[PDB]
Coordinates of C-alpha atoms and ligand atoms in Angstrom, one line a residue:
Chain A
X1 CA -85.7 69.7 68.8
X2 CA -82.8 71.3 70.8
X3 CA -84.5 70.1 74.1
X4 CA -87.3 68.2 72.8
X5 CA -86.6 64.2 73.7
X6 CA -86.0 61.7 70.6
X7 CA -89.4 60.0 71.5
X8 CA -91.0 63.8 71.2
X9 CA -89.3 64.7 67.9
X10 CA -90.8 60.9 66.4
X11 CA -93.9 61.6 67.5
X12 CA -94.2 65.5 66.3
X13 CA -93.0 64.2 63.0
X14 CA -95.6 61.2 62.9
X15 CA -98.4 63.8 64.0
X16 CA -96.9 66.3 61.2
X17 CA -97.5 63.8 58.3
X18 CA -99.3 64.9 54.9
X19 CA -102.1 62.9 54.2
X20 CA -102.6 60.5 51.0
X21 CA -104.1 62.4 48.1
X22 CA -106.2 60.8 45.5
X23 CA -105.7 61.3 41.3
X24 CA -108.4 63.3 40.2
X25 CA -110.1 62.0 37.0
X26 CA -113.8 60.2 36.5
X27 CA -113.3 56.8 37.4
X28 CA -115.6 55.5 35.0
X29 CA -114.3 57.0 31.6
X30 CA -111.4 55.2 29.5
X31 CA -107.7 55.7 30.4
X32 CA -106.6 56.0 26.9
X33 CA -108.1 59.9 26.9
X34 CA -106.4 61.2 30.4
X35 CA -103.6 62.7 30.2
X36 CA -100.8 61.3 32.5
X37 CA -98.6 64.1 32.7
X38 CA -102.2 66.1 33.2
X39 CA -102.9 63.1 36.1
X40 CA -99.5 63.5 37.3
X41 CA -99.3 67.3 37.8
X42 CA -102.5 68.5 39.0
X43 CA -101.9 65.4 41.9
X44 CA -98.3 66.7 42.9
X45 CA -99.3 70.7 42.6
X46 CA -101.8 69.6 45.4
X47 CA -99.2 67.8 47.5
X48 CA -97.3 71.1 47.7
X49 CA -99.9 72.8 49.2
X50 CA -100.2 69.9 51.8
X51 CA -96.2 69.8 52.1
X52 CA -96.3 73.3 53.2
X53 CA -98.3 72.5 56.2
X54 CA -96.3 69.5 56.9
X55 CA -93.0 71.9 57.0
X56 CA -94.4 73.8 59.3
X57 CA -95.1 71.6 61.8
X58 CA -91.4 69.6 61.6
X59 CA -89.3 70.8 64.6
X60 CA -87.1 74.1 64.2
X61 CA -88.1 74.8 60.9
X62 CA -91.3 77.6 61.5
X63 CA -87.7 79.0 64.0
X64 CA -86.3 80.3 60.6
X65 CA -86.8 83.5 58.5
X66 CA -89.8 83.1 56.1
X67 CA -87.0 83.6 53.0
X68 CA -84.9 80.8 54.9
X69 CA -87.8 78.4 54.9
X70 CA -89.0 79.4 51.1
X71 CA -84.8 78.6 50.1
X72 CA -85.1 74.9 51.7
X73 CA -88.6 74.2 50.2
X74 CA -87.7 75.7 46.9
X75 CA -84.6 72.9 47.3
X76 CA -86.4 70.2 48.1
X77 CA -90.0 70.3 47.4
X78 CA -89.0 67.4 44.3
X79 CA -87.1 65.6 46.9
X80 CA -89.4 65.3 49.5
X81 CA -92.7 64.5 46.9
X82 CA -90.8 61.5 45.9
X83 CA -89.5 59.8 48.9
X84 CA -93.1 60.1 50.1
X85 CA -93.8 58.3 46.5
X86 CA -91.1 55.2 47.0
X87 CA -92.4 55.0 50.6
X88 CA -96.3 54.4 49.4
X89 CA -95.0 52.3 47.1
X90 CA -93.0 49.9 49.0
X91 CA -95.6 46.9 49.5
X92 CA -96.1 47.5 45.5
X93 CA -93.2 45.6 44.0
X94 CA -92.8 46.3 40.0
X95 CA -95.2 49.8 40.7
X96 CA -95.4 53.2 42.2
X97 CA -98.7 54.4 44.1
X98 CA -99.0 57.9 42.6
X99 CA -102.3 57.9 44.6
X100 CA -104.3 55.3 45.6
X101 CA -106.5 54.8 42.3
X102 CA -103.2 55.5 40.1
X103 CA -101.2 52.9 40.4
X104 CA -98.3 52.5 37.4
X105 CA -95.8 50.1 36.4
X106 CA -92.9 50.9 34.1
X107 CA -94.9 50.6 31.1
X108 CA -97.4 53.4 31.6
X109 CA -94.3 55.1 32.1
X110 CA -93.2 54.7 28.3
X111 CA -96.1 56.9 27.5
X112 CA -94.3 60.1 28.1
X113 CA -91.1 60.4 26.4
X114 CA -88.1 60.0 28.7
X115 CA -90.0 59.4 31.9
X116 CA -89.4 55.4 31.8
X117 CA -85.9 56.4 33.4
X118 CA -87.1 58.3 36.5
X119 CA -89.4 55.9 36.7
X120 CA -87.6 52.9 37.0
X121 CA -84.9 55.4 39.6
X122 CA -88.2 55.1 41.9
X123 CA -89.1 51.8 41.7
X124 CA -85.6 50.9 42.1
X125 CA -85.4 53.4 45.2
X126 CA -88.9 51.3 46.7
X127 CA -87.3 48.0 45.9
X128 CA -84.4 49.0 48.5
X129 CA -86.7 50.4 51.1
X130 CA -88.2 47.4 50.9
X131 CA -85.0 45.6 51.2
X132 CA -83.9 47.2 54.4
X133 CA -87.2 47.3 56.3
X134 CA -87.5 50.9 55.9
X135 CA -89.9 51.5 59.0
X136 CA -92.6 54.6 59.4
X137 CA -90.3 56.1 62.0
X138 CA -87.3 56.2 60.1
X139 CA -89.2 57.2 56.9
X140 CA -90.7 60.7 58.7
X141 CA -87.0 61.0 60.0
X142 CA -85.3 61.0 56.5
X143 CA -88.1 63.1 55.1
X144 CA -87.2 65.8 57.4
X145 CA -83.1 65.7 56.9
X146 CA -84.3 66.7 53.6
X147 CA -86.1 69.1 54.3
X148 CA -83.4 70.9 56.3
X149 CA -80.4 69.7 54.6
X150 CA -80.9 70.3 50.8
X151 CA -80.5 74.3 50.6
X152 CA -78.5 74.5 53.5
X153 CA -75.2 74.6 51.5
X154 CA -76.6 76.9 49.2
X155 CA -77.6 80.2 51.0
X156 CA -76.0 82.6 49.0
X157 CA -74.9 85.2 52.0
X158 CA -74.0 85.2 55.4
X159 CA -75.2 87.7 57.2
X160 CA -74.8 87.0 60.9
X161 CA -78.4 86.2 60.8
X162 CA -77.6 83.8 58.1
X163 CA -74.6 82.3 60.3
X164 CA -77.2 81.8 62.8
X165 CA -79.7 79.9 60.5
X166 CA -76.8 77.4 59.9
X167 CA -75.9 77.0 62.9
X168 CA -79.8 76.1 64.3
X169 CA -80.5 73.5 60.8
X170 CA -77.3 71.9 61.6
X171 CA -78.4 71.5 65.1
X172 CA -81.8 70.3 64.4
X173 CA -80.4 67.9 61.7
X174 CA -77.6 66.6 64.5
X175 CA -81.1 65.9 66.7
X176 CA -82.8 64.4 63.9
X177 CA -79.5 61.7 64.1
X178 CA -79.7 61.4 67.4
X179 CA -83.8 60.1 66.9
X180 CA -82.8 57.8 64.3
X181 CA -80.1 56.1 66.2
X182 CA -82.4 55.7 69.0
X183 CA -84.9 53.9 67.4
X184 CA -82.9 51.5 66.3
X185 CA -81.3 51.0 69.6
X186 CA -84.9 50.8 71.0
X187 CA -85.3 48.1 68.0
X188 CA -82.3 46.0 69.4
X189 CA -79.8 46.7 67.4
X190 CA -76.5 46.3 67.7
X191 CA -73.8 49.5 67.9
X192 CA -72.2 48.5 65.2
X193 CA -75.8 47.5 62.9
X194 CA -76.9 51.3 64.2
X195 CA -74.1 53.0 62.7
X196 CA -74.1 50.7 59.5
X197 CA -77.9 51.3 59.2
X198 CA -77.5 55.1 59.6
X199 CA -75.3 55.1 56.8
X200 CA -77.2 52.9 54.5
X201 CA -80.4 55.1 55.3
X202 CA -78.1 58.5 54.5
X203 CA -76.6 57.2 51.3
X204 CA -79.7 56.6 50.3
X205 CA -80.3 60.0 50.7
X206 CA -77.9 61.2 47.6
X207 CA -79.7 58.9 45.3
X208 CA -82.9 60.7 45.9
X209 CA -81.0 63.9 45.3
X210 CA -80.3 62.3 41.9
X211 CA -83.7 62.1 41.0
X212 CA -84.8 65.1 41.8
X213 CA -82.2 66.9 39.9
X214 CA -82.9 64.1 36.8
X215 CA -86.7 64.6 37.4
X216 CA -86.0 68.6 37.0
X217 CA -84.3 68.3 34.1
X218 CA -87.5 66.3 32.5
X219 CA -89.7 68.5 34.0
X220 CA -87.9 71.7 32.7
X221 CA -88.5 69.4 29.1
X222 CA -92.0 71.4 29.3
X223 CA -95.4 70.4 29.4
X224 CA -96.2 71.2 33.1
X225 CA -96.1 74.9 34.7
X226 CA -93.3 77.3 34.9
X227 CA -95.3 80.2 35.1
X228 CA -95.2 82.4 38.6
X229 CA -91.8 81.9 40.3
X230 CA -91.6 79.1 42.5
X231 CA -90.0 81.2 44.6
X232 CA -92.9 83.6 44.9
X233 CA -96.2 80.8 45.1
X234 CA -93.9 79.0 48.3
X235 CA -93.5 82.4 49.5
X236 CA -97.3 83.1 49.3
X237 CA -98.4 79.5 51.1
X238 CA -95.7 80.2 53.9
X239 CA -96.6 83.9 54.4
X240 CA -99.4 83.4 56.2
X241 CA -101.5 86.0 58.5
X242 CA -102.6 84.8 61.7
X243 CA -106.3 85.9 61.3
X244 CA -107.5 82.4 61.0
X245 CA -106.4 81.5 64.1
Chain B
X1 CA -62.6 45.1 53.3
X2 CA -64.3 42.2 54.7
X3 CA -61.8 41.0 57.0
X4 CA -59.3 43.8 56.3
X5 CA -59.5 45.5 59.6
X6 CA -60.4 49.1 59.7
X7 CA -56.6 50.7 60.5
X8 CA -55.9 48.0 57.3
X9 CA -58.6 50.3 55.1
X10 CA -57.7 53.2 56.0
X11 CA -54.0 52.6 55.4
X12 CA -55.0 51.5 51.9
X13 CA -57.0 54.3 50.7
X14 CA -54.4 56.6 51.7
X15 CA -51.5 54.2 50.0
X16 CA -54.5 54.3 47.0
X17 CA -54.2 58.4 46.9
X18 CA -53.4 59.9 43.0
X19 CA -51.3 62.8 42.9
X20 CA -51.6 66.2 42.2
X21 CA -51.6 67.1 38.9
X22 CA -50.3 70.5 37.2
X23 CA -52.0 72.7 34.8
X24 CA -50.6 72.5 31.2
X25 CA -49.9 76.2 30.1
X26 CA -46.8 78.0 29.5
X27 CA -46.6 79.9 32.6
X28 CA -44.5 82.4 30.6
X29 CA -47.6 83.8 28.5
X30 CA -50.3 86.0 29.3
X31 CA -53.7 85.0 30.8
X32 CA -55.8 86.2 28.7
X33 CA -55.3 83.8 25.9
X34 CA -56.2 80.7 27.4
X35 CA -59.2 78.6 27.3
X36 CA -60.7 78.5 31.1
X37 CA -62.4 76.0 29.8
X38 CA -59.5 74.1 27.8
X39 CA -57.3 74.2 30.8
X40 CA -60.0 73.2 32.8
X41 CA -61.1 70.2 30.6
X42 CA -57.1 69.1 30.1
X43 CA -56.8 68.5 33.4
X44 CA -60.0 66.8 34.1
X45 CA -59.1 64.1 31.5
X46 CA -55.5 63.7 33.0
X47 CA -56.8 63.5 36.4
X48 CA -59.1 60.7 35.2
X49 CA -56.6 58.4 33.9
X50 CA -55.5 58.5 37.4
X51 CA -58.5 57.9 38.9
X52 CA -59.2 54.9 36.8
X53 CA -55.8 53.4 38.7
X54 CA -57.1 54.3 42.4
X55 CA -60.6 52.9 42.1
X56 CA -58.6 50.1 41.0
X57 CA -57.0 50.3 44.9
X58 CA -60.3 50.6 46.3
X59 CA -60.4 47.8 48.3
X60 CA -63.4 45.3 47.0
X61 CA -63.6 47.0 43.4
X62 CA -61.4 44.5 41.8
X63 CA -63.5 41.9 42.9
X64 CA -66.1 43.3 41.1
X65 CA -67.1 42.6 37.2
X66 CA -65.6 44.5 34.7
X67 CA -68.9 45.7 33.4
X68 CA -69.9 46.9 36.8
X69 CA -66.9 48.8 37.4
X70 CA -67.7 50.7 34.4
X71 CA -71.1 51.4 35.5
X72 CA -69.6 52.4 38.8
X73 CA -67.4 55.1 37.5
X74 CA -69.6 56.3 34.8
X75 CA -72.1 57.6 37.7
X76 CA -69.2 58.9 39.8
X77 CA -66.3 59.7 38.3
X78 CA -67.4 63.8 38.3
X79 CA -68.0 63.9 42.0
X80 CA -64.9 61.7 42.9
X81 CA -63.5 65.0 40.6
X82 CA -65.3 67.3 42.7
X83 CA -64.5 66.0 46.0
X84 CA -60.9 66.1 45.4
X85 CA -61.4 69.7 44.2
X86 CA -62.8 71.0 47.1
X87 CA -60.3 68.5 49.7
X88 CA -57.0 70.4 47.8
X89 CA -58.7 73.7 48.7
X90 CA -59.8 73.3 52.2
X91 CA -56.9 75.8 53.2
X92 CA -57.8 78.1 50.5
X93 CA -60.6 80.3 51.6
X94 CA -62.9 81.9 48.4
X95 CA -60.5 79.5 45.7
X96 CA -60.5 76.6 43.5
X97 CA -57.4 74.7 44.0
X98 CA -57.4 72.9 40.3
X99 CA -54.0 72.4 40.2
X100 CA -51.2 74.2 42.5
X101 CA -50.7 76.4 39.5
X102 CA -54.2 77.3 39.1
X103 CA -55.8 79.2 41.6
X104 CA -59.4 80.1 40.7
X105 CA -61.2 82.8 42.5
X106 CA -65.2 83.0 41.7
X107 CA -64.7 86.1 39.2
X108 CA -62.8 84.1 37.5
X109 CA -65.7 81.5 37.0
X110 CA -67.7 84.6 35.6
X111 CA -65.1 84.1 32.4
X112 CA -67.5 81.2 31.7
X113 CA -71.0 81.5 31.0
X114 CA -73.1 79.4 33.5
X115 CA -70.0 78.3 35.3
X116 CA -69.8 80.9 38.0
X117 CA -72.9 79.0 40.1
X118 CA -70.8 75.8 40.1
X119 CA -67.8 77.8 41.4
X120 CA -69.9 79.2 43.7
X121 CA -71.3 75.2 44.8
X122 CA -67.8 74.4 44.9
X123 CA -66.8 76.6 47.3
X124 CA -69.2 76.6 49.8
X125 CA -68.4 72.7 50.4
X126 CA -64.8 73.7 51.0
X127 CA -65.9 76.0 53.3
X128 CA -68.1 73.4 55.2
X129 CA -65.6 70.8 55.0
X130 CA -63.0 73.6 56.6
X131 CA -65.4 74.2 59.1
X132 CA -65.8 70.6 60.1
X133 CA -62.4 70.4 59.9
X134 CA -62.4 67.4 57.6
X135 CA -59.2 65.1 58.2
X136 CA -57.4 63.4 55.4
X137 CA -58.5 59.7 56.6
X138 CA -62.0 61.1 56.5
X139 CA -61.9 62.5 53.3
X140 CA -60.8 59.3 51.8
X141 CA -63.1 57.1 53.4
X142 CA -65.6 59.5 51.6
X143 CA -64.0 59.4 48.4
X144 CA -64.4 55.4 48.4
X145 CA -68.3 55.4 49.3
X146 CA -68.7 57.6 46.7
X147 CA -67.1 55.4 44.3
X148 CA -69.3 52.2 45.7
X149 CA -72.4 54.1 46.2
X150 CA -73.2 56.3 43.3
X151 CA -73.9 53.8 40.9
X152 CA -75.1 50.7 43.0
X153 CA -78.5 51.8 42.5
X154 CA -79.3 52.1 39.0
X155 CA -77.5 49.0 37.2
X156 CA -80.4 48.1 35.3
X157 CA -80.6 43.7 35.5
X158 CA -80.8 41.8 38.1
X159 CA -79.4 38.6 37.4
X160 CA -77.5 36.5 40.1
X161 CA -74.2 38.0 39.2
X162 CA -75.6 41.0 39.8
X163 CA -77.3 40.5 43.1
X164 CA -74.2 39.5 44.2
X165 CA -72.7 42.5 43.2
X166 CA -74.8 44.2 45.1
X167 CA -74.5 42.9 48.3
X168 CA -70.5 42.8 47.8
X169 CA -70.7 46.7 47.3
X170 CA -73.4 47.1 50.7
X171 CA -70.6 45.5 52.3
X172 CA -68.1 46.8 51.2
X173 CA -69.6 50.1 52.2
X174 CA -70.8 48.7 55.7
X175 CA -66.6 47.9 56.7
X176 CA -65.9 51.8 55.3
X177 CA -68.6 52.8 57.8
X178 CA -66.5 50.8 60.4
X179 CA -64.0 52.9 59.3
X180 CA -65.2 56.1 59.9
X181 CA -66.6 55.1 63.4
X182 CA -63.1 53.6 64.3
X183 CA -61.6 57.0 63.1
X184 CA -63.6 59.2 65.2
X185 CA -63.7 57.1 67.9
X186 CA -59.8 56.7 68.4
X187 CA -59.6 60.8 67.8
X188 CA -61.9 60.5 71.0
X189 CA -64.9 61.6 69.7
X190 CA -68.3 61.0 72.2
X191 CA -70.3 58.1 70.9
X192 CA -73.0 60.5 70.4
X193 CA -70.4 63.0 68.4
X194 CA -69.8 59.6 66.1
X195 CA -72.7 59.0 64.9
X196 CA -73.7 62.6 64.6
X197 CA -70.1 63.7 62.8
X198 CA -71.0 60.1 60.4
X199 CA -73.9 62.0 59.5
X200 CA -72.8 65.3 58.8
X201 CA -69.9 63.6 56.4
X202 CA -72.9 61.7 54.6
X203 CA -75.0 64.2 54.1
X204 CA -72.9 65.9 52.0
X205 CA -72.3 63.8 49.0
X206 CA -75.5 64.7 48.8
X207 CA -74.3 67.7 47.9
X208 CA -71.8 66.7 46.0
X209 CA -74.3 65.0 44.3
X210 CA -76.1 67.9 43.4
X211 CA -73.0 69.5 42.2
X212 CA -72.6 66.8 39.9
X213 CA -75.4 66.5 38.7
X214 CA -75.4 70.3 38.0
X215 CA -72.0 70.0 36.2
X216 CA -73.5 67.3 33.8
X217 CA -75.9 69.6 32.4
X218 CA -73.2 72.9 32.7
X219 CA -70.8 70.3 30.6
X220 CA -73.4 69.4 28.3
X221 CA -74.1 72.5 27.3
X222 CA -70.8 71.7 25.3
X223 CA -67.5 73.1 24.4
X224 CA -65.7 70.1 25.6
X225 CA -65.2 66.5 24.7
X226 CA -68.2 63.9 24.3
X227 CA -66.5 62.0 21.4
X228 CA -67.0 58.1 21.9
X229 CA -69.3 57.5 24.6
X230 CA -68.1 57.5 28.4
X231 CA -68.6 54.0 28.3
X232 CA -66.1 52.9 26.1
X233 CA -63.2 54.9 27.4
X234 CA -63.6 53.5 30.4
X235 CA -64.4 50.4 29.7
X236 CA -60.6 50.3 27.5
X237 CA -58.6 52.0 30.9
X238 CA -60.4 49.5 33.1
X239 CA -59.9 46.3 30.6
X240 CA -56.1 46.2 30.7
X241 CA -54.6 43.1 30.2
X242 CA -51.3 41.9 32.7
X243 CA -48.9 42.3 30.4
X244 CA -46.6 44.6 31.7
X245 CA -47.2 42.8 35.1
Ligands
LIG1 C1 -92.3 61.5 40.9 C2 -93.2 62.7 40.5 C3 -94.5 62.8 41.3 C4 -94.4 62.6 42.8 C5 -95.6 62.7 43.5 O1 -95.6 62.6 44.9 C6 -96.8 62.9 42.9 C7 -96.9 63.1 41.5 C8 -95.7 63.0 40.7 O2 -95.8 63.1 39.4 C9 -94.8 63.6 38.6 C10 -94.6 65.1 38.7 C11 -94.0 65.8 39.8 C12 -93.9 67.2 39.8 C13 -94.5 67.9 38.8 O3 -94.5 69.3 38.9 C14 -95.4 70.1 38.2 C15 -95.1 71.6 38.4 N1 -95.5 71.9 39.8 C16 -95.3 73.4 39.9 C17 -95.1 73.7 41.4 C18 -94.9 72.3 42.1 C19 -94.7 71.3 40.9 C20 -95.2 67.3 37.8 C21 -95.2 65.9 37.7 C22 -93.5 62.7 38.9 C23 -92.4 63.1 38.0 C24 -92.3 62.6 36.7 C25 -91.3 62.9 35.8 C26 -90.3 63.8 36.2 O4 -89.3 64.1 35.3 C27 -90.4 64.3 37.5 C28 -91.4 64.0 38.4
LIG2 C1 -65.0 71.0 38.9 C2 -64.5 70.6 37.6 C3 -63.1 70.1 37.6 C4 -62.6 69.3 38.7 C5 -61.2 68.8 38.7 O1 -60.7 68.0 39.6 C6 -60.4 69.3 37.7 C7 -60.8 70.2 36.7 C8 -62.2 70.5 36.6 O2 -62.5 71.4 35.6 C9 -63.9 71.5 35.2 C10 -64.2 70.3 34.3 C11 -64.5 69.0 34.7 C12 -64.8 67.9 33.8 C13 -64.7 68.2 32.4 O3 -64.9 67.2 31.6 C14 -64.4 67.2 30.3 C15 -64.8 66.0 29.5 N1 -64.0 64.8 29.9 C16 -64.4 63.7 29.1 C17 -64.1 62.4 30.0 C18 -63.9 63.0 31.4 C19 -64.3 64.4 31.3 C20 -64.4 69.4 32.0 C21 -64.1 70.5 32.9 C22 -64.8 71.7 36.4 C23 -66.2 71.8 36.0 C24 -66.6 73.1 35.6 C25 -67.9 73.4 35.1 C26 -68.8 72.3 35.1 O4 -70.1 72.5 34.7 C27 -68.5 71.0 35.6 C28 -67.1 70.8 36.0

């Protein structure tokens, strides 16, 4: 990513990508008895896993300490699970593709007490993807500025090592630009549309900040799981031995 | 801002700037008799009235409803805070420059309960923006998109009027891009350093975002003031009639 080409860093990222989970509930029983926040869990607890992996694999992250890379994922993991979820849901006007055989509109969102607002945050997030043209390249590109960018204000000390480990996210994040503007050179745009379109794409950015914190803020309205640090279950999947290599 | 030219923006927002406001406590009593959080709170309100006359400077808010410019300020008016918090103490390294008689250090955030994380927040983005050695055409350029951008994603309707609206706003913020560029670029920044330095800037209101956000939920876990909705307030300083034209 520090001498890896723009046309290498798009295509590690497009190799790097999670793949589409499906809900997990018998397909031929009512929908009156499931649980959505049940539904809804148990489908995101197993994107995590999967979003690990993913991390891994984008450029210059598996370069930082294992408590540097648990800090950004412990930032961003809400982040990151829904921009993948306005970005599946983009060709779904009025609805958001939880997983392929869950798809909701605002409605089934009324079922759980104060999750109509998120959801209508994320369909109105999808409606301006849509909007722009948001395209695969640019999606995996945005994806990973998140990744690196949420918890990089907030490491606490700084050690030299920490320094360091700014210095290197900032420097990734700086390539990650540089890939972004050179798509949409390569897509014929104009200078001036490239700078305008970066900033569109980066604003957008803070909104799904917004969310996540919002989301949070539901989510800590219990119901779900709070039990195990999430500090400690991201530190587990990212500790890995080498023994199955 | 749509045929304003970009040295014609940036001229405004700086002509568009509020002032610096005091803390209200007699400077010839002791310390520890004063509310942190009453002086802090004090000043926020006063601060507000002000900021209520610069969005109105803002080049393109006018031309927006009145409605919408409520909305607008409702989502942003504690970053817009925050921003100019951390601007005023760029040159002061580990403290809170509230007001030029109130010097904060983060031990003295520990007075509060909760609030010592926010100070914490707070800091760290002066130290970033020192570091990037933020300039004051920069910062205000910021300050503006903020303004525009918070918001423009969650006004519920979407009648004509408000699709309008919309696109006004995306432009709007498209000419302050122009801005930025034309900044950089005339302080003779690469092109590459452009787009990369736009970036850095707009990645953090996502930050500020966050710290927002974060506030909210710090300020509602009350002490303070959340007598007649936000709205209304608002909606009364923003609804002024030309009287004293
Ligand atoms: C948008 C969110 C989402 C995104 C996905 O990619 C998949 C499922 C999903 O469901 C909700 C969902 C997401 C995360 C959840 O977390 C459960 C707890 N685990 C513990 C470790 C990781 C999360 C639960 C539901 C949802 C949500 C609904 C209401 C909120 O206030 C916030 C988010
Ligand atoms: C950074 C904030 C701030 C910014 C300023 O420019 C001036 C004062 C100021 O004080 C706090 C402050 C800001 C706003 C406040 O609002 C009081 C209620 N009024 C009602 C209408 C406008 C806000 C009170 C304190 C602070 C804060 C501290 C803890 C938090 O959790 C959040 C913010």
């Amino acid at each position: 990513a520090l001498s890896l080409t723009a046309d290498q860093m798009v295509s590690a990222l497009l190799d790097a990508e999670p793949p589409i989970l499906y809900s997990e509930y018998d397909p031929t029983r009512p929908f009156s008895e499931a649980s959505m926040m049940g539904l809804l869990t148990n489908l995101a607890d197993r994107e995590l896993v999967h979003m690990i992996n993913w991390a891994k694999r984008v450029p210059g992250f598996v370069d930082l300490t294992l408590h540097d890379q648990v800090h950004l994922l412990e930032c961003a993991w809400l982040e990151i699970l829904m921009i993948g979820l306005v970005w599946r849901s983009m060709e779904h006007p009025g609805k958001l593709l939880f997983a392929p055989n869950l798809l909701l509109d605002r409605n089934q969102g009324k079922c759980v007490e104060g999750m109509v607002e998120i959801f209508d945050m994320l369909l109105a997030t999808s409606s301006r993807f849509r909007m722009m043209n948001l395209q695969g390249e640019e999606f995996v590109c945005l994806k990973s500025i998140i990744l690196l960018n949420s918890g990089v204000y907030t490491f606490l000390s700084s050690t030299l090592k920490s320094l360091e480990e700014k210095d290197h996210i900032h420097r990734v994040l700086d390539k990650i630009t540089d890939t972004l503007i050179h798509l949409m050179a390569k897509a014929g745009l104009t200078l001036q549309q490239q700078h305008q379109r970066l900033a569109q794409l980066l604003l957008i950015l803070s909104h799904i900040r917004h969310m996540s914190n919002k989301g949070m803020e539901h989510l800590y309205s219990m119901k779900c799981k709070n039990v195990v640090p999430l500090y400690d279950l991201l530190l587990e999947m990212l500790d890995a031995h080498r023994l199955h290599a």
